[model samples]
Target chain A: MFMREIELRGHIIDSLILPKVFDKILDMGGDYKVLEFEIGKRKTDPSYAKILVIGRDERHVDEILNELRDLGAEIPEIEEVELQPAEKDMVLPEGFY
Target chain B: MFMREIELRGHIIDSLILPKVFDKILDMGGDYKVLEFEIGKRKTDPSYAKILVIGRDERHVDEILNELRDLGAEIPEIEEVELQPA
Candidate 1:
């Protein structure tokens, strides 16, 4: 499975956005792991959730992640994926997808 | 995190139940890993999903499992949860 870390901030709990986010995750065929979550006390407070999205494939993971992003999800550890040329023709970087 | 193996049976596909199931799991503050999954070819055939749920605590895992069970999910690896009493 492919994995990507996603974080959500702001009034997630009060707005019921967290559950709504999860709904999209599974709707697009993916799983997740909660890396960390800190729920704020007051409505003005901010609640947080860091999740690892597990997809069937790298392509699918990206598709699913893009949707999550549209829903206000953020890729916490944002970085360009490293690139490596194929040793042989018709081959791809270990995780090209 | 506490983990438990859970199996989901029946028409998890045509019924569009898998996504909804995952929704509840996360709603209750749980994570998951897809150990294995097989989608049935024919409507008469069965689709299966073996998931590993990771909960905040043992009690929470149990609570999540019970809820999943109520939603047509199964615990094919059904076994006792070893304990170390305090």
Candidate 2:
């Protein structure tokens, strides 16, 4: 299996990003084990997560990573995220609370 | 605050239903605690989860329950849960 370590940081809990990321991984035929998770203690604090994403192969892992990046997940040492800064205004689509 | 005990059973893990259910609850400003979770031992088996869904008020809880039914969660006692049977 092909695998990579990725991290996500922000208001993941209340914003529902954490579950969405997990769902997306499974939805795309990939799987993940959460290596580390830190939930924010205060409303204004940010949460952080490190995950091990597993795929069937290299191509498969890349495909999974491609989709995850859209949700603000980042692969360490491989790419610099182009979007979704933690503090940016979240203008989500319909029903995306 | 208002709360209800609900249950879910099916191919929840591989199907991504569990996380979706959790996201739905929090998305609507509700909260949940997993009372019990029994993961399937085999790929063909079904998984089960009993959750406590919490809301700020009766109306809020009702609203959250309404949305959760779409994802196959069932409230116990107060309603028969015509849509999703656990």
lDDT of 1 by residue, B21-81 (tens): 6666888999776566554433246656677788989999889877876665342322222
TM-score of chain A of each: 0.67, 0.68
As for model 1, its CA RMSD to the true structure in angstroms is 12.3
Residue by residue across A14-97, what tens digits does model 2's lDDT show? 344555667788888977776655544333455566777777776887788778886563433222122223543322233422
**Runs with alpha carbons beyond 4 Å of true place in candidate 2:** A1-97, B73-86
Residue B86 CA displacement from its true place in model 2, Å: 13
lDDT of 2 at A94: 32
* DockQ score of the complex predicted as candidate 2: 0.04
- Evaluated with TM-score, which candidate comes out highest? 2
Worst 10 residues of 1 chain B by lDDT: B75-84
lDDT of 1 at B79: 25
Weakest lDDT window of 10 consecutive positions for candidate 2 chain B = B75-84
State the lDDT of candidate 2 residue by residue for B1-86, as single tens digits. Answer: 98888877665444445566677888899888766655443334555667788999989987988788765634221212232333
* Residue range A1-97, candidate 1, lDDT tens digits: 6667777776443243545566788788886665665534332455566777778777897898788776662433221121222333322244655
